[PDB]
């Protein structure tokens, strides 16, 4: 149902990446150390190149953005908010677009527990010029991870 | 429309920081609407010349080295017909693996390629990491076109591209004869009998 | 289009009373800066601006979470959404858009009523030294840059010092870019 | 379902054919199509390499597209670790790799799994016209744009037979 | 009924007079900068301003915590008259007992700031009334890192000095100055504690 969940900031950093080794109701993952950063660079560059070629190919006035990228095995689902903060999500087949869940996370978990957390920041940047893509920092909030592993767990 | 005749792909390969991308922008159309480099890796640039009353379109793919894209680059040399190994005379460790780039590019590019070798940043000629006569010799027993580019004068690199497209042209120059289409007669009133 | 969806968000949002709270809260935290500096008034504007910045930068993600909006680019669209579904959602009021520039750049933001200076009378020593609702310039300067614009806001006049209206003359100076995810190889 | 633009790219990156069908607009100058086609070849390469804890059947049918027809029986595909279908709001992009490596790209102005089933039975019927009318062509060298003018109004009839 | 505005801008206003308190004490006049119309304003934001209180000199922290109850004092003694105009029946100014104004505050103030009652109230009969609420509203959304739960209570301890000032203000509306302390006091099923003096 769900293989992996990722966030990307405005300043081109993966900041959250829940992977499921065996999927199912529960699994292991979230190690940025085990080449998760290299996978994030591949995931980001893919979505950035396809988001770049969509705006050159978009007639109309309200330009569009990626809704899903299939492959022969899995799918990529996106929700690119206007503040430059991208929810990508790698899934299985036999079920339609997860855009309702992907805005439910933004409307009930991220703004509930990260942006309205005021101990931890919203920028997620130490504040240097080595934060353009090349620095790595993580929010790690205890209540955020608990409810985010709680909600996706029925979708095995 | 499009109306060109042939289309070649030419890789630019080397170590990182040897100065390939600044070499690419000065001599050819650039920054059209390309998203950038590193987002997908290996930026693409285009150059349109004509040889022998045929129109030639050349796409130059400056390969990017970041260790992360090393697996991706292999697949990008598939079908690559023109090639250019770039090295800088100031630094010296690029020439230790320039031969390795040639070996990797003789592998899985085409049946036959035409690899040039170009010395960027000859503005720092006084800072010569490797002698030009050794690289000239190493081009001579590897059948390679050899160039020294100032990076302040674009005439040398432009001349190199024109001659490289000539040598790769005659290599693939398919024979052509004529398309005149002038043979007309037979305007009658058709006394047919079947 | 918008004003239907603004009332649609005014049917599923958590509400409380705008009188007897929040004018109290903002007036108490401007009375603290009045007494904390120790009765100097051209400094409290440059602390309320620097506080409104930090309260706007986190508000913008809540506002994009409530209503699904794209990244606004021209000043037709920002001026439409600020008058129709930002101030209507958060503060129940709506402004109006006059004093439009040449070349689609710098406009004014006349506020009809104001639930920050509501039922406040301002003392005579700050007729020409204080801006009262200068958390609003903080939320606009620290909120419009977070949709990757770059702006400048300032009050021009206020009801407390002057018969003319409360208006903010927001200026577009430049539009910022998106950055490419490495320096180089 | 529907198709608005045929794009045929090579086995080595840059494209050899495109013909916007009733687009009535030219958003991209002809030169851009080359960097778009090379970008699709690159992201088709990249979408191989990321794949999650998987490592584990694409059987279309005959829907009678185009009105005898070209084939009768369910068949297979040839790419699994690779890009197959992009989906956005204005359009939807299908892509189809052959076994030899020759990708066919179809941009679709009709949006919102059965679209795969109707899509690849059209993108194999453009592959049969490619192998019938461009391969038997001694003026056509390999690795060259498709300058034949029979291939255009052999595929225009089948796509206006679709939509 | 009444004219209304949204709770999510008020609660986010209510969370952050403590960065305002350290920006008023530390800035008497890594820090950053911004500009306006031929000016500049030197900015410091909230994550790098509550964390100057984990490294606070002890007279500086205790100088800050008087200001939080001073804010609460001003909003309480300004709030009590408008809650009198709401209803506030059957109590007096000198007010010889204390439970009838502790029945007032949990039903009448704490609904108008937080929407519910103080759900527990314990009666020491010599004048120490315990006011316990289980899920306090502005501290619904604060958490530290991956199981570093010891070092966050002492980090977040300025944030309870607003309802010191609230109950100072609504009792200085009824006459006098008192003494106040706070607790944490976790629940029994799916806390905070205030005294009276």
UniProtKB/Swiss-Prot annotation, chain A:
It holds the Pfam family Sybindin. Belongs to the TRAPP small subunits family. BET5 subfamily. Part of the multisubunit TRAPP (transport protein particle) I complex composed of BET3, BET5, TRS20, TRS23, TRS31 and TRS33. Part of the multisubunit TRAPP (transport protein particle) II complex composed of BET3, BET5, TRS20, TRS23, TRS31, TRS33, TRS65, TRS85, TRS120 and TRS130. Part of the multisubunit TRAPP (transport protein particle) III complex composed of BET3, BET5, TRS20, TRS23, TRS31, TRS33 and TRS85. It is found in: Golgi apparatus, cis-Golgi network; Endoplasmic reticulum; Preautophagosomal structure. Transmembrane segments: none annotated. One of its GO terms (cellular component) is TRAPPII protein complex. Keywords: Autophagy, Endoplasmic reticulum, ER-Golgi transport, Golgi apparatus, Transport. The keyword Endoplasmic reticulum applies. PANTHER family: TRAFFICKING PROTEIN PARTICLE COMPLEX SUBUNIT (PTHR23249), TRAFFICKING PROTEIN PARTICLE COMPLEX SUBUNIT 1 (PTHR23249:SF16). GO terms for biological process: endoplasmic reticulum to Golgi vesicle-mediated transport; intra-Golgi vesicle-mediated transport; macroautophagy; retrograde transport, endosome to Golgi. This is Trafficking protein particle complex subunit BET5. InterPro entries: Longin-like_dom_sf, TRAPPC.
UniProtKB/Swiss-Prot annotation, chain B:
One of its GO terms (molecular function) is GTPase activity. It comes from the Eukaryota. Its main location: Golgi. The keyword Protein transport applies. Changing residue 120 to I: Blocks nucleotide binding. The keyword Protein transport applies. GTP binds at residues 14-21, 62-66, 120-123. It is found in: Golgi apparatus membrane. InterPro entries: P-loop_NTPase (IPR027417), Rab_GTPases_membrane_traffic (IPR050209), Small_GTP-bd (IPR005225), Small_GTPase (IPR001806). A motif (Effector region) lies at residues 36-44. Residues 180-191 have a biased composition (Low complexity). Changing residue 66 to L: Reduces GTPase activity. Gene3D superfamilies: P-loop containing nucleotide triphosphate hydrolases. Alternates between an inactive form bound to GDP and an active form bound to GTP. Activated by the guanine nucleotide-exchange factor (GEF) TRAPP complex, and inactivated by GTPase-activating protein (GAP) GYP3. Keywords: Acetylation, Autophagy, Exocytosis, Golgi apparatus, GTP-binding, Lipoprotein, Membrane, Nucleotide-binding, Prenylation, Protein transport, Transport. It holds the Pfam family Ras. It is a lipid-anchor. GO terms for cellular component: cellular bud neck; cytosol; endosome; Golgi apparatus; Golgi membrane; mitochondrial outer membrane; recycling endosome. Required for protein transport through the secretory pathway. Probably involved in regulation of secretory vesicle formation at the trans-Golgi compartment. Mediates the proper polarized localization of SEC2, a GEF for SEC4, but does not alter the exchange activity of SEC2 on SEC4. Plays a role in autophagy. Present with 4298 molecules/cell in log phase SD medium. Belongs to the small GTPase superfamily. Rab family.
From Swiss-Prot, chain C:
This is Trafficking protein particle complex subunit BET3. A lipid is attached at residue 72 (S-palmitoyl cysteine). Its main location: Golgi. Gene3D superfamilies: Trafficking protein particle complex subunit 3. One of its GO terms (biological process) is retrograde transport, endosome to Golgi. It comes from Saccharomyces cerevisiae (strain ATCC 204508 / S288c). Belongs to the TRAPP small subunits family. BET3 subfamily. Present with 2370 molecules/cell in log phase SD medium. CDD domains: TRAPPC3_bet3 (cd14942). It is found in: Golgi apparatus, cis-Golgi network; Endoplasmic reticulum; Preautophagosomal structure. GO terms for cellular component: cis-Golgi network membrane; cytosol; endoplasmic reticulum; phagophore assembly site; TRAPP complex; TRAPPI protein complex; TRAPPII protein complex; TRAPPIII protein complex. The gene is BET3.
Curated annotation (Swiss-Prot), chain E:
Transmembrane segments: none annotated. Keywords: Acetylation, Autophagy, Endoplasmic reticulum, ER-Golgi transport, Golgi apparatus, Transport. Its main location: Golgi. Component of the TRAPP I, TRAPP II and TRAPP III complexes which act as guanine nucleotide exchange factors (GEF) for YPT1. TRAPP I plays a key role in the late stages of endoplasmic reticulum to Golgi traffic. TRAPP II plays a role in intra-Golgi transport. TRAPP III plays a role in autophagosome formation. Required for sporulation. Has a role late in meiosis following DNA replication. Pfam families: TRAPP. It comes from the Eukaryota. GO terms for cellular component: cis-Golgi network; cytosol; endoplasmic reticulum; phagophore assembly site; trans-Golgi network; TRAPP complex; TRAPPI protein complex; TRAPPII protein complex. Belongs to the TRAPP small subunits family. BET3 subfamily. It is found in: Golgi apparatus, cis-Golgi network; Endoplasmic reticulum; Preautophagosomal structure. This is Trafficking protein particle complex subunit 33. One of its GO terms (biological process) is protein-containing complex localization.
């Amino acid at each position: 149902g769900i293989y992996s969940f990722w966030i990307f900031d405005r300043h081109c950093n993966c900041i959250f990446d829940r992977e499921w080794t065996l999927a199912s109701n529960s699994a292991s993952g979230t190690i940025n150390s085990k080449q998760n950063e290299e996978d994030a660079k591949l995931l980001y560059g893919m979505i950035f190149s396809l988001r770049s070629i969509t705006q050159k190919l978009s007639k109309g006035s309200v330009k569009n953005d990626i809704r899903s990228i299939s492959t022969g095995k899995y799918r990529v689902h996106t929700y690119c908010t206007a503040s430059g903060l991208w929810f990508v999500l790698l899934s299985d087949f036999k079920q339609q677009s997860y855009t309702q869940v992907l805005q439910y996370i933004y409307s009930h978990i991220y703004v509930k527990y990260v942006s309205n957390n005021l101990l931890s920041p919203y920028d997620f940047a130490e504040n240097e010029n080595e934060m353009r893509g090349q620095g790595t920092r993580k929010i790690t909030n205890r209540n955020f991870i608990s409810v985010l592993e709680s909600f996706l767990a029925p979708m095995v | 429309g499009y109306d060109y005749d042939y289309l070649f792909k030419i890789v630019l390969i080397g170590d990182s920081g040897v100065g390939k991308s600044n070499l690419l922008s000065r001599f050819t159309t650039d920054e059209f609407n390309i998203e950038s480099k590193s987002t997908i890796g290996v930026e693409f640039a285009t150059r349109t010349i004509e040889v022998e009353n045929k129109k030639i379109k050349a796409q130059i793919w400056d390969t990017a080295g970041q260790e992360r894209y090393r697996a991706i680059t292999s697949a990008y040399y598939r079908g690559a017909v023109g090639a250019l190994i770039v090295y800088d005379i100031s630094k010296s460790s690029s020439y230790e693996n320039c031969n390795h780039w040639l070996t990797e590019l003789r592998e899985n590019a085409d049946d036959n390629v035409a690899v040039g070798l170009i010395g960027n940043k000859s503005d720092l000629a006084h800072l010569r990491a490797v002698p030009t006569d050794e690289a000239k010799n190493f081009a001579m027993e590897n059948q390679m076109l050899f160039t020294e580019t100032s990076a302040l004068n674009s005439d040398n690199v432009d001349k190199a591209f024109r001659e490289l497209i000539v040598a790769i042209f005659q290599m693939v120059s398919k024979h052509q004869v004529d398309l005149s289409g002038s043979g007309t007669n037979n305007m009658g009133s058709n006394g047919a009998p079947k | 289009s918008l004003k239907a969806m603004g009332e649609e968000i005014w049917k599923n949002k958590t509400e409380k009373i705008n009188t007897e709270l929040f004018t109290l809260t903002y007036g108490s935290i401007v009375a603290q800066l009045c007494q904390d500096y120790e009765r100097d008034f051209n400094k409290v504007n440059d602390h309320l601006y620097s506080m409104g910045y930090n309260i706007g930068c986190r508000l913008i993600e809540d506002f994009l979470a409530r209503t699904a909006l794209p990244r606004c680019e021209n000043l037709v669209k920002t001026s439409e959404v600020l008058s129709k579904c930002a101030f209507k959602i958060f503060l129940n009021i709506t402004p109006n858009i006059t004093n439009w520039s040449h070349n689609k750049d710098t406009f004014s933001l006349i506020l009809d009523e104001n639930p920050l200076a509501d039922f406040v009378e301002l003392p005579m020593d700050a007729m020409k030294s204080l801006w009262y609702s200068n958390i609003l310039c903080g939320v606009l300067k620290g909120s419009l840059e977070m949709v990757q614009l770059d702006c400048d806001v300032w009050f021009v006049s206020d009801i407390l010092r002057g018969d003319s209206q409360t208006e903010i003359k927001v200026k577009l100076n430049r539009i910022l870019k998106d950055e490419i995810p490495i320096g180089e190889d | 379902m529907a198709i608005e633009t045929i794009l045929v790219i090579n086995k080595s990156g840059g494209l050899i054919y495109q013909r916007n069908f009733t687009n009535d607009e030219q958003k991209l100058n002809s030169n851009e199509y080359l960097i778009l086609a090379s970008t699709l070849h690159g992201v088709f390469a990249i979408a191989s390499q990321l794949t999650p804890k998987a490592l584990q059947n694409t059987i279309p049918y005959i829907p009678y597209v185009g009105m005898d027809d070209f084939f009768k029986e369910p068949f297979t595909n040839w790419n699994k670790s690779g890009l197959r279908q992009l989906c956005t709001d204005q359009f939807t992009m299908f892509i189809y790799q052959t076994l030899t490596g020759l990708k066919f790209v179809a941009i679709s102005s009709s949006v919102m799994n059965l679209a795969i089933q109707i899509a690849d039975n059209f993108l194999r019927k453009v592959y049969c016209l490619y192998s019938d009318y461009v391969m038997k062509d001694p003026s056509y060298s390999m690795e060259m744009p498709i300058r034949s003018n029979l291939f255009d109004e052999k595929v225009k009839k089948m796509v206006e037979n679709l939509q | 009924s009444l004219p209304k505005v949204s709770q999510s801008v008020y609660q986010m206003l209510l969370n952050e007079m403590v960065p305002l308190a350290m920006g008023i004490e530390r800035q008497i006049s890594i820090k950053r900068l911004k500009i306006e119309e031929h000016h500049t304003v030197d900015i410091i934001r909230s994550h790098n301003l509550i964390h100057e209180l984990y490294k606070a000199d002890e007279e500086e922290k205790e100088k800050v915590l008087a200001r939080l109850r001073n804010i609460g004092f001003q909003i309480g003694l300004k709030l009590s008259e408008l809650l009198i105009f709401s209803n506030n029946p059957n109590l007096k100014f000198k007010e010889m007992d204390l439970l009838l104004i502790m029945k007032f505050i949990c039903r009448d103030v704490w609904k108008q700031i937080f929407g519910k009652q103080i759900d527990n109230l314990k009666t020491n009969h010599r004048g120490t009334f315990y006011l316990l609420d289980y899920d306090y509203r502005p501290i619904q959304s604060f958490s530290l890192e991956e199981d570093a739960k010891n070092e966050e209570l002492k980090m977040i301890e300025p944030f309870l000095e607003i309802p010191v000032g609230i109950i100072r203000g609504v009792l200085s509306s009824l006459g006098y100055s008192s003494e106040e302390v706070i607790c944490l006091a976790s629940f029994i099923d799916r806390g905070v504690s205030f005294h009276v003096q």
